Design a protein around this ligand. Structure first.
Ligand SMILES: CCCCCCCC/C=C\CCCCCCCC(=O)O[C@H](COC(=O)CCCCCCCCCCCCCCCCC)COP(=O)(O)OC[C@@H](O)CO
Ligand SMILES: *[C@@H]1O[C@H](CO)[C@@H](O)[C@H](O)[C@H]1NC(C)=O
Lengths: 272, 106
């Protein structure tokens, strides 16, 4: 799986911002330098295996498409009822061994590219249909778009996943710690189990009483760290009397069955 | 048409006074993409904070990670301050850390 995202912000006719990045699985692998119009390789294996000349062709292709995309939108904004300021987001990519290309206007589904042409989302209305008229004006450009999705993109993964799987298949052990959360109500405590630094993403964390999983465990969102690892808080609300013998248990692929077990204990209780 | 940011603050490692750590503020689920995020130390903005490249989720809402290396001490409070078009006033979310036992017995 690989995809590219575009964030194009149209603040007024004279002011825009264009942010572009590439993603292998959920990992960021490429960025676009708006100045100098350069593809930036976040990892040594981000170049995949394509030659420097081929990347120049890809840079030129995206550069020209970017210039006439912004110009085309500004030319047709009034016909399309696009009111400044507005944001257009695009995501397109594939899966090796799943082509897609979707476009949003003001944060909602607007059009998508299917097989060989742009199709409007029915709910996006008549302006999405008018937009597809502009996008479908040149079938040859759509054939190139189709080939980017069905030929270039799968080929890019060949030379990207393999060249970097030493990264995507890393195992990084979590660390965990316990703290007090905000108290939920009178006479109750919130126990917080933090789990940090693990990779890959799948993880198991429960508050426990011995072997019994406490089904009040509330698992938060899995949140990113800049080093590529993940973080999560799992909270348990308990009555003040009933916090004895509670532990937080973490299971993760990197641990090879050796779960992290921390105990609500010591100054946390607090003991005497 | 507009979506308010979710704001989540966390450290990379358990807080230990005198030990360098990383403070994270994950801002997500918002639209449009224009947003202002600051990490605060004792109510004052921290200089030279890093952030990830802007990205968005499946539902098209945007997200960013702001982060900085820091060394907490006992007297320090940290927070994340976010301003967005959906907010009347900037929203401040604290870094919740546990400072150990309060009442001294020794
Ligand atoms: C970070 C770098 C990563 C490098 C990746 C390396 C690996 C490469 C491997 C696989 C790539 C697979 C995915 C490729 C998807 C490409 C989709 C594509 O190219 O589709 C384009 C959409 O434009 C782009 O996304 C490309 C560059 C433009 C960006 C503009 C700002 C963001 C978008 C906002 C503007 C709205 C769009 C339409 C405005 C229309 C206006 C009439 C439309 O096609 P078109 O033929 O150009 O249409 C004619 C038009 O230009 C003028 O009439
Ligand atoms: C890709 O790697 C192969 C070796 O597996 C090499 O022969 C080829 O030259 C590389 N790519 C291109 C575009 O040449």
């Amino acid at each position: 799986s690989f995809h590219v995202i575009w964030i194009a912000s149209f603040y007024n006719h004279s002011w825009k911002q264009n942010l572009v990045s590439g993603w292998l699985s959920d990992l960021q692998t490429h960025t676009w330098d708006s100045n100098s119009s350069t593809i930036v390789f976040l990892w040594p294996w981000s170049r995949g295996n394509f030659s420097n000349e081929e990347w120049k062709e890809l840079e030129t292709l995206f550069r020209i498409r970017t210039i006439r995309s912004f110009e085309g939108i500004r030319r047709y904004a009034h016909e399309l009822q696009f009111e400044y300021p507005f944001e257009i987001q695009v995501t397109g990519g594939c899966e090796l061994h799943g082509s897609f290309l979707q476009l949003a206007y003001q944060g909602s589904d607007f059009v998508s590219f299917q097989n060989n042409s742009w199709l409007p989302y029915p709910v996006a209305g008549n302006m999405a249909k008018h937009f597809c008229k502009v996008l479908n004006q040149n079938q040859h450009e759509n054939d190139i778009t189709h080939n980017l999705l069905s030929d270039t993109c799968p080929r890019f993964i060949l030379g990207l996943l393999d060249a970097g799987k030493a990264h995507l298949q890393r195992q990084v052990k979590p660390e965990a710690w316990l703290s007090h959360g905000p108290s939920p109500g009178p006479g109750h405590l919130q126990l917080v189990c933090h789990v940090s630094g693990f990779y890959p993403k799948p993880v198991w964390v429960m508050w426990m009483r011995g072997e019994q999983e406490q089904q009040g465990t509330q698992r938060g969102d899995i949140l990113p760290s800049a080093d590529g690892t993940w973080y999560l808080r799992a909270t348990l609300e308990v009555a003040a009397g009933e916090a004895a013998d509670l532990s937080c248990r973490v299971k993760h692929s990197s641990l090879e069955g050796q779960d992290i077990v921390l105990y609500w204990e010591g100054s946390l209780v607090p003991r005497g | 048409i507009q979506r308010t940011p979710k704001i989540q603050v966390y450290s990379r490692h358990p807080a230990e006074n005198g030990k360098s750590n990383f403070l994270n503020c994950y801002v997500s689920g918002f639209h449009p993409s224009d947003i202002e995020v600051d990490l605060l130390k004792n109510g004052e903005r921290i200089e030279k904070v890093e952030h990830s490249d802007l990205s968005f989720s499946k539902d098209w809402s945007f997200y960013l990670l702001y982060y900085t290396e820091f060394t907490p001490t006992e007297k320090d409070e940290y927070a994340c301050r976010v301003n967005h078009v959906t907010l009347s006033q900037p929203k401040i979310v604290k870094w919740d850390r546990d400072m150990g036992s309060l009442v001294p017995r020794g």
